Amino acid sequence: KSRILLNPRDIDINMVNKSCNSWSSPYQLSYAIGVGDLVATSLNTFSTFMVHDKINYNIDEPSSSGKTLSIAFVNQRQYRAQQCFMSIKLVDNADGSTMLDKRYVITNGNQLAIQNDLLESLSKALNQPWPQRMQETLQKILPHRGALLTNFYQAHDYLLHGDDKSLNRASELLGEIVQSSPEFTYARAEKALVDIVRHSQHPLDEKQLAALNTEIDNIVTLPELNNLSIIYQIKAVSALVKGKTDESYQAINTGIDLEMSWLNYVLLGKVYEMKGMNREAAEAYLTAFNLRPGANTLYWIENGIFQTSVPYVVPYLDKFLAS
Amino acid sequence: KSRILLNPRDIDINMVNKSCNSWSSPYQLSYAIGVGDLVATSLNTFSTFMVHDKINYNIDEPSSSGKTLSIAFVNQRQYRAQQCFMSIKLVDNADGSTMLDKRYVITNGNQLAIQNDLLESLSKALNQPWPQRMQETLQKILPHRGALLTNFYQAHDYLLHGDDKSLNRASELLGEIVQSSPEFTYARAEKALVDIVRHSQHPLDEKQLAALNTEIDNIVTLPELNNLSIIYQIKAVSALVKGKTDESYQAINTGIDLEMSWLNYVLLGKVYEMKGMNREAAEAYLTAFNLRPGANTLYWIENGIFQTSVPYVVPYLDKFLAS
């Protein structure tokens, strides 16, 4: 009657010892945040696991999570200002057993190889083969020029933050990546998404908007970006900006089929709100908060595309956060 | 710190007022149990919802389930011994709102049509189109001769119970269905699964076993049963009986890809046990108990194919049930 049953197919991801030294460390942290987001979104999209990415969530509450993946920075303390290594452990919460225990030295360059090793290991530890669409998607959404990965993860963290100054910096970082890596079409698409969100924040003039819209038109038809959620994210945000709710609804649902992510649920909430469907909006926003609880997701719920009252539209979450 | 966050994509199914009158009613109840199992397994297999079928679970504990689907029998009380109707309601637990509210009069005959209406309605209410493999699977695993549905659901309930006397009755019911409906190949496969489990309970002689094995060989190659979990369930249980763990492991994993069900997780637990992997067995058994908690699932964990000590092999569950 009082006990809560643990669910082995519900997993939390936590970060411990973010401040490994007392400051940073302005590359390893956004990398770890990127890895955690990728693992969560990959498992949510392509498996029957449910993952709560709690990397941005500073609170311990009771949960039915049967497993916890913990990313921790660990200092060998062999000399002052020695860089921390990254400890990644997967623990079964039912019996306390360690299912995976990795020690990773990150070297600007080897980010992708380390991430690949982790994904291979998780696959074995979770009895979870990665489907072909997942494998294909990872080849397209990550840069293959290693010198660009630090800045790519940095842009990713700015996107998660969501505020105008963060998005302006994300756009700049991505513009440099596009110039440095013209073949990495995904970065051009991510920049277009960021820029259309930026337009909701600070409207462009007629000329600049027509140029953005033309850029969007060119991007969404690129054959190599077919079957990526990003195209549908762009279509959905563009439709929202245009007030076209049916077109936005169609696009975001297809986006969600391709990527079960906090961001796609926020966007679906925005569509429902625009449709005058607050109950359905509240459900979507709660889903996004479940997927990645904390200030980042709440920022997007409250401010993304247009302003949303959490007390009025999502009272459950208002109450939850107060309690 | 003390509050538990509700997950809108976690759903519980409950039954209320099973004893609608004081007795029964020996057709409407196993039908409702069958519907609840089908909805749970369908959503678990083909969506990102996680469903806990609590129809066989007589306990209220705290959970993160964001929605509850309740099946209730309701008496109009217009004359004594009037048959109850079936109330099915889906409630959002975050805000208390009713998402679906059905009143169903069951008439021996219309079982499938009512179930189809419910599945259509759930699809709309949950923003969840049913994929083509789901639609195809439902056409194959349910009898289309309506006169046979009551007995089919009865056999299903016996399979859930798992004990030798229940399986003997399931086998008989299914044998009559096969005779009455030779085109309904699924019933022949379900009977073969039941009979091989029955053989683990009460070994057949050499002659009868060779006949069963020949029947299994003929069934598993039938083209119309390709892409159904039942074929892999049969292959997995046959391999377990033969002590062939690699062959069983391969079959049950493919079964699970096709059907995320409590039974498939029990079978995977048995394979892991046979492999000498108690930790992995414990994880699978806990998964099955999550999917359909209660006496039925526990029976299969403790007794299915071979005996399993819950205190030794699944201490988390031993402790959970005691607390």
Same domain, B303 and B213: yes
Q: Show residues of chain B in contact with A280, CB under 8 Å.
A: 127
One DSSP character per residue, B213-245 reads HHHHHHHHT-GGGTT-HHHHHHHHHHHHHHT-H
Tell me the C-alpha distance between A93 and A308, whole Å: 37
CA angle A153, A8, A290 (to 5 degrees): 50
Q: Which of A106, A136, A162 is the last residue of a domain?
A: A162
Which tokens is B230 given? 């039942």
A7-16: strand order across its sheet: A50-53, A7-16, A65-74, A85-92, A98-104
User: Which chain A residue has the Cα nearest residue B323?
Assistant: A3
Interface residue of B254, B271, B285, B316 to substitute, partner A, most A CBs within 10 Å: B316
The SS3 of residue B104 is strand
CATH of the domain at B196: 1.25.40.10
Tell me the C-alpha distance between B301 and B264, whole Å: 11
Instruction: Tell me which residue has tokens 């009272």.
Output: A315
Helix axes A245-258, A229-242, angle to 10 degrees: 160
Same domain, A116 and A220: no
Alpha carbon of A54: minimum distance to chain B alpha carbons (Å): 12
One DSSP character per residue, B110-167 reads -HHHHHHHHHHHHHHHTT-PPPHHHHHHHHHHS-SSGGGHHHHHHHHHHHHH-SHHHH
CB B7 to CB A127 under 8 A? no
Same domain, B232 and B154: no
CB B4 to CB A48 under 8 A? no
Report how many domains make up chain B: 2
Tell me the C-alpha distance between A163 and A198, whole Å: 9
CB B7 to CB A315 under 8 A? no
CB A2 to CB B316 under 8 A? no
Closest CA to B91 of B195, B18, B14: B14
Same domain, A197 and A158: no
Same domain, A48 and A134: yes
Upper half-sphere CA count for residue A135 (Cβ side, 13 Å):
7
Alpha carbon of A9: minimum distance to chain B alpha carbons (Å): 7
User: Which chain B residue has the Cα nearest residue A7?
Assistant: B290
| Strand A50-53 relative to strand A7-16, pairing | parallel
Q: Show residues of chain B in contact with A2, CB under 8 Å.
A: 61-62, 323
- Return the CA Rg of chain A: 20
Same domain, B169 and B305: yes
Same domain, B90 and B142: yes
The residue type at A223: P
Alpha carbon of A294: minimum distance to chain B alpha carbons (Å): 12
- Backbone φ and ψ for B79, nearest 5 degrees, come out as -165, 160
CB A97 to CB B279 under 8 A? yes
User: Which chain B residue has the Cα nearest residue A268?
Assistant: B127
Which tokens is B213 given? 């094995």
Alpha carbon of B144: minimum distance to chain A alpha carbons (Å): 31
Cα dihedral A180→A186→A192→A193 (10° resolution): -140
Same domain, B151 and B190: no
Residue A2: Cβ-neighbour burial (10 angstroms; 0-12, 13-18, 19+): exposed
CATH of the domain at A101: 3.40.50.11830
Secondary structure letter of residue A146 according to DSSP: G
Give helix then strand counts, H and E, for chain B: 14, 5
User: Which chain A residue has the Cα nearest residue B58?
Assistant: A1
User: Which chain B residue has the Cα nearest residue A261?
Assistant: B48
Cα dihedral A15→A17→A22→A28 (10° resolution): -50
Q: Are B47 and B131 in contact (CB under 8 A)?
A: no
Q: Show residues of chain B in contact with A253, CB under 8 Å.
A: 127
Which tokens is B59 given? 């306990």
One DSSP character per residue, A221-256 reads T-GGGTT-HHHHHHHHHHHHHHT-HHHHHHHHHHHH
Which tokens is A29 given? 């942290």
Could you list the residue range(s) of the whole structural domain that residue B184 is in?
163-323
Which tokens is A90 given? 């997967």
Q: Are A260 and A218 in contact (CB under 8 A)?
A: no
Alpha carbon of B67: minimum distance to chain A alpha carbons (Å): 10
Alpha carbon of A214: minimum distance to chain B alpha carbons (Å): 32
CB B279 to CB A315 under 8 A? no
Same domain, A98 and A195: no
CB burial string B188-207: b at 16+ within 10 A, e below: bbbbbbbbbbbbbeeeeeee
Residue in A61, A92, A253 nearest the CB of B4: A61
Tell me the C-alpha distance between A199 and A193, whole Å: 10
Q: Are A53 and A291 in contact (CB under 8 A)?
A: yes
Tell me the C-alpha distance between A15 and B94, whole Å: 28
CB B316 to CB A287 under 8 A? no
Residues of A with CB under 8 A from a CB of B: 1-10, 44, 48, 50, 59-64, 66, 92, 94-95, 97, 127, 253, 260, 279-280, 282-283, 286-287, 289-290, 293, 315-316, 320, 323
Same domain, B271 and B139: no
CB B286 to CB A62 under 8 A? no
Same domain, B155 and B180: no
Q: Which of B100, B127, B162 is the last residue of a domain?
A: B162
CB B50 to CB A9 under 8 A? yes
Same domain, A39 and A136: yes
B65-74: strand order across its sheet: B50-53, B7-16, B65-74, B85-92, B98-104
Q: Are B49 and B88 in contact (CB under 8 A)?
A: no
CB pairs under 8 A between A and B: 101
Secondary structure letter of residue B78 according to DSSP: S
Which tokens is B307 given? 């005996």
Q: Which of B162, B178, B198 is the last residue of a domain?
A: B162
How many Å separate Cα A4 from the centre of its chain?
Answer: 29
